[PDB]
Amino acid sequence: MLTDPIADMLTRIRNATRVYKESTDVPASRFKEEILRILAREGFIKGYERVDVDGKPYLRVYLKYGPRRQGPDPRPEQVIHHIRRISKPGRRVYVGVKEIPRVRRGLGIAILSTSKGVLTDREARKLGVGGELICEVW
Amino acid sequence: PTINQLVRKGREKVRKKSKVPALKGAPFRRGVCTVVRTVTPKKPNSALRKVAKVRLTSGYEVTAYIPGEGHNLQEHSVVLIRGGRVKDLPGVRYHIVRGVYDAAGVKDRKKSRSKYGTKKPKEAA
RNA sequence: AGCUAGUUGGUGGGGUAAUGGCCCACCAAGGCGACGACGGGUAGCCGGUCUGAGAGGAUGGCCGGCCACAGGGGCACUGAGACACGGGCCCCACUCCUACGGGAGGCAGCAGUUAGGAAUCUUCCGCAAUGGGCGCAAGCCUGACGGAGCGACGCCGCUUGGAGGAAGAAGCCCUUCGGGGUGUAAACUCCUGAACCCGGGACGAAACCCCCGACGAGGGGACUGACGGUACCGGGGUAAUAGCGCCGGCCAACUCCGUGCCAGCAGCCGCGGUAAUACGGAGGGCGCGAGCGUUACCCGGAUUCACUGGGCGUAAAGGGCGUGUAGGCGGCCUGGGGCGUCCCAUGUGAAAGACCACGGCUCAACCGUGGGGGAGCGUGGGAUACGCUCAGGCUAGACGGUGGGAGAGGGUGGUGGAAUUCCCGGAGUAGCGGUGAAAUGCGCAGAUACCGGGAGGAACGCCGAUGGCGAAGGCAGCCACCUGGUCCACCCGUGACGCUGAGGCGCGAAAGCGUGGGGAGCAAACCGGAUUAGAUACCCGGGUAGUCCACGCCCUAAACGAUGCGCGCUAGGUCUCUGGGUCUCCUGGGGGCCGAAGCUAACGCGUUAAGCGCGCCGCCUGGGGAGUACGGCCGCAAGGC
RNA sequence: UUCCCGGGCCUUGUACACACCGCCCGUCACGCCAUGGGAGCGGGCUCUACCCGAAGUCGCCGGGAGCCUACGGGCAGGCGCCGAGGGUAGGGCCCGUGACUGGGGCGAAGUCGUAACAAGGUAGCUGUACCGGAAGGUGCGGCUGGA
RNA sequence: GGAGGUAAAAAUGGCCAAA
Numbered sequence A: 001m002l003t004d005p006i007a008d009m010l011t012r013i014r015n016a017t018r019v020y021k022e023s024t025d026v027p028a029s030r031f032k033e034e035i036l037r038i039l040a041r042e043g044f045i046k047g048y049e050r051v052d053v054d055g056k057p058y059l060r061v062y063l064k065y066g067p068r069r070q071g072p073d074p075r076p077e078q079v080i081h082h083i084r085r086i087s088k089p090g091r092r093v094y095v096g097v098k099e100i101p102r103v104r105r106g107l108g109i110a111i112l113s114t115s116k117g118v119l120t121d122r123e124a125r126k127l128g129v130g131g132e133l134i135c136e137v138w
Numbered sequence B: 001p002t003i004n005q006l007v008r009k010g011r012e013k014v015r016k017k018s019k020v021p022a023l024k025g026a027p028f029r030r031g032v033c034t035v036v037r038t039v040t041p042k043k044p045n046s047a048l049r050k051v052a053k054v055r056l057t058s059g060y061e062v063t064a065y066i067p068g069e070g071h072n073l074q075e076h077s078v079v080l081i082r083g084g085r086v087k088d089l090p091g092v093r094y095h096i097v098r099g100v101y102d103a104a105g106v107k108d109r110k111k112s113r114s115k116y117g118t119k120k121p122k123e124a125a
Numbered sequence C: 001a002g003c004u005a006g007u008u009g010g011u012g013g014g015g016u017a018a019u020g021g022c023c024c025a026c027c028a029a030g031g032c033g034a035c036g037a038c039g040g041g042u043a044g045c046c047g048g049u050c051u052g053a054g055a056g057g058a059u060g061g062c063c064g065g066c067c068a069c070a071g072g073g074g075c076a077c078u079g080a081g082a083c084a085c086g087g088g089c090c091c092c093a094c095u096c097c098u099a100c101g102g103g104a105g106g107c108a109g110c111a112g113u114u115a116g117g118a119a120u121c122u123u124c125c126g127c128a129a130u131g132g133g134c135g136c137a138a139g140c141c142u143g144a145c146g147g148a149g150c151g152a153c154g155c156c157g158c159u160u161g162g163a164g165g166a167a168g169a170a171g172c173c174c175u176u177c178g179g180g181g182u183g184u185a186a187a188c189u190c191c192u193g194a195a196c197c198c199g200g201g202a203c204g205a206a207a208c209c210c211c212c213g214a215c216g217a218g219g220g221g222a223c224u225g226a227c228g229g230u231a232c233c234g235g236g237g238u239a240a241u242a243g244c245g246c247c248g249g250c251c252a253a254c255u256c257c258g259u260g261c262c263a264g265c266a267g268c269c270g271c272g273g274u275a276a277u278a279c280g281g282a283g284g285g286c287g288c289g290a291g292c293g294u295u296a297c298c299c300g301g302a303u304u305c306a307c308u309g310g311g312c313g314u315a316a317a318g319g320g321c322g323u324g325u326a327g328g329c330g331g332c333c334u335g336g337g338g339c340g341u342c343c344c345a346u347g348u349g350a351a352a353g354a355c356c357a358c359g360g361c362u363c364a365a366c367c368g369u370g371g372g373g374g375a376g377c378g379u380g381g382g383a384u385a386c387g388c389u390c391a392g393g394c395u396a397g398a399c400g401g402u403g404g405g406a407g408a409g410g411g412u413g414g415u416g417g418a419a420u421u422c423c424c425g426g427a428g429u430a431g432c433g434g435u436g437a438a439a440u441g442c443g444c445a446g447a448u449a450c451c452g453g454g455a456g457g458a459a460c461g462c463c464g465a466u467g468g469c470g471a472a473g474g475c476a477g478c479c480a481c482c483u484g485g486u487c488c489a490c491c492c493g494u495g496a497c498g499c500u501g502a503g504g505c506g507c508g509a510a511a512g513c514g515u516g517g518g519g520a521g522c523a524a525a526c527c528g529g530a531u532u533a534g535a536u537a538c539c540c541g542g543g544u545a546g547u548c549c550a551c552g553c554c555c556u557a558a559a560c561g562a563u564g565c566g567c568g569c570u571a572g573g574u575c576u577c578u579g580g581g582u583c584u585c586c587u588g589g590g591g592g593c594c595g596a597a598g599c600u601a602a603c604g605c606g607u608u609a610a611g612c613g614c615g616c617c618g619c620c621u622g623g624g625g626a627g628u629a630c631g632g633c634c635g636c637a638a639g640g641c
Numbered sequence D: 001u002u003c004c005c006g007g008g009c010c011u012u013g014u015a016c017a018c019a020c021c022g023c024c025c026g027u028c029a030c031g032c033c034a035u036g037g038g039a040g041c042g043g044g045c046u047c048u049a050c051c052c053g054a055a056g057u058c059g060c061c062g063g064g065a066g067c068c069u070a071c072g073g074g075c076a077g078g079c080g081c082c083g084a085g086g087g088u089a090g091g092g093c094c095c096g097u098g099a100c101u102g103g104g105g106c107g108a109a110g111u112c113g114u115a116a117c118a119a120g121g122u123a124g125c126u127g128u129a130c131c132g133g134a135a136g137g138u139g140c141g142g143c144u145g146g147a
Numbered sequence E: 001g002g003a004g005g006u007a008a009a010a011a012u013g014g015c016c017a018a019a
Ligand SMILES: NC[C@@H]1O[C@H](O[C@H]2[C@@H](O)[C@H](O[C@@H]3[C@@H](O)[C@H](N)C[C@H](N)[C@H]3O[C@H]3O[C@H](CO)[C@@H](O)[C@H](O)[C@H]3N)O[C@@H]2CO)[C@H](N)[C@@H](O)[C@@H]1O
Pocket: D107, D110
């Protein structure tokens, strides 16, 4: 029944990066589109698009990978090493503007929902809003 | 456990118990011996360790160890309990401070005199 | 695990500076509790202090704030203020004085005594400073205070010298005797100079007071120091205390001799029973140094209660299974509110402490002056993504409808055949049974082997499987009735109706228990025969409960997949059970094996996860003691939780 | 080449590893300690009911009796409720102790047997029931942590 | 040809002890 549709989307992507697929179908929702829009603007995925599957609205997330390595295990490197939910429905996480975590000295991002909309750790710190720490991507 | 279970039950503290019941952790306790004798150690060792059943100022009566070589403890000699058990003696979890009221220091002792309570010898040097 | 009589509310009063059952009269029957009442145990609370990367953990001593007590207990009086520490009344315990009838006292104020204890100080000096009371003032009082004393209790500073000095004295230790070490260490030579002696000598003190000025503002003058002749300055001047722990690994520092599981050491691992770097001493070395070790306690390390930050197949840990109450959590779209959430502004968050600068004591410890924001909470304003609520809509979740499918799912009644045992009849003999071999046992009283008839109880061969069904336990001849679950096709209706589920409730193999029935085979206990040193066992011959039915209990287990439930995602290959189809093949549910990625300590798991994630429940926190004891609840008992 | 002794290669089981001349279980004997039950005994705290009840506030009387400067008044005094505490009785919790008794831990070399680990010589374990010096045996059912 | 699968034996080993 999708107790957590936001964290489920992050796992549908995490399960696809390890199998190296081109795209995967995730349920459609305006809030999930804001999360994927940040993933595309930050360069983690190629993008997304509103598709139709058996009459139901879905979103095809075009995955992204690194160059093909050489030697044993030539599987390409991941552009998304690991993505996971922080604020879960069992334990809600809300942060201000001073209590914002630094994801890998700024190398990684931290998507978080604010009153201004879905922003990153850099955008919410510049606008000075903050809010529900949705997820961290390293 | 889940987050809903932690707000309900929570985490239990350790609350470790004392290994030396000296009445609220007193560093020392005065007492008088009742019997002075020797008891055999455990399997890995074999000797005749000098111990004494001491009845202290708190009603308790526990045996303590007598360190060093040679003593002057009798059936009616007052001593001072220190603490610390003897690995080889079952039941003995205390030590007797040498150099106190009726416990004399180890004679002819020269290396470790802070322990065994021995004075500084002077031989014109 | 239930509690509650002024108990909860109302009306009218008493009392208070003032609300209030604070107390009283009458009326109503309420009030509190798993969001943990009531009861028991412990404890003054905080700023802070210690630790910690942080989050946290521990703690509340000096200092500052609040509270509570003044020998134990009750009470009022005066008063702005007290139920009053050096005011009052009474009771009790103790102490003292008594002409014996009736009198005084309250160190948890400063010192000091006694007792307890491991342990905690002077019956010191002055009101000079600050502050308090009274007084207009002069001034008086002030064990508050400012100081001095004792104590390495802590922190900080300082001394026991500095520069030379032998291829390297004496003694002591080791040795392979050649020498090596203590060791520039010493003596010795120069230099400086803590102690001590002499002289000088404070800051802390400026007002109150007195004059001019109107006893105002402003200006001028005078008095006063406990510390103390201390600090400090100047002159002179003596080479002038070193101790403690450790040297097997952790952990830094190695040799000799003595002892021989003795004496002894030990924080963990562990050393010692004749050559011990681990015992005792010596030399030498290592670490600190007026300190060094030990004990006790707090934090850390311990991510070893895991919020940050842990686990549960086999290491400790999935509840035996289900149904569900509370609770926790919840699909897609559109608005309203703005509770959570976020931002801004404002007030508060005392001082001290902490941190950063600067400065005063010759430095520091200590201390002074600036500066920086916390966290929380109150108020005003704004933002609305998400969580919440309200209203509307949706279909992918869920449930229903129509038509079909398989199955040992459950209960009730009836019914079939094989086999065993016994009875009856006929035929027929000298043994049958049983074992590793035997013997008990049965048998000429006619046994075992055979035929025929009858009685009774229990279990259902082949089919049958690596099979199916159920939530679990568990379910197998055949027929019928009643009845549960489940799967598929059609996509027909409702429309978020969902997941989990502490408690409760129900089911729950075998054994066991109660009442009644039944009892063929089997078979605890029991009895014989064997075996053996012994047999309370294994083997053999008998055999009672029980095994079977009805009703009611008992609630356990290796109740196992040692794997809680639901949902979404992540290669496949192959066997099989069961539906649907344009039945070669595709698709859905279920049971197995091998295995991508991945996971695991490994074995192994791997779309029937132990992989990747979310929700909820249950459980673990080293082993023995122990699933024990006590208590509680349940049970007829055994016994169970 | 069945059997007895020794040996080689592979495989299988193990709780053995100074290694089966291994390991290991329970009872019994002796010693130390702690703890449960136990005729009971003692103490501490607390609760309920009643009896007596100081001081004191409050309320009534202040009269056949008192003192007063204003007297429809005040004071002394008398009575009553509450009340510290004391007494009697019965309960609740906690602690100390008690002849004796139960099991437990711990203590180099004591006695009895062989239960388990190699099909441990009867696969082992397990719930329950009965029996037995003791490990344990047996019945019924279950498990693979056996073939 | 796949399951169902065969016991006659026989107890014990003092304590501590090498990087
Ligand atoms: N939890 C300990 C228990 O000990 C029990 O066993 C206890 C006794 O049976 C056993 O006694 C053993 C004995 O088994 C063995 N056959 C002989 C041995 N000398 C005895 O030893 C015992 O007694 C001697 C003095 O006689 C003591 O010096 C020694 O420390 C002690 N272990 O010693 C144990 C107590 O020390 C059972 N094993 C069991 O219930 C459990 O393991």
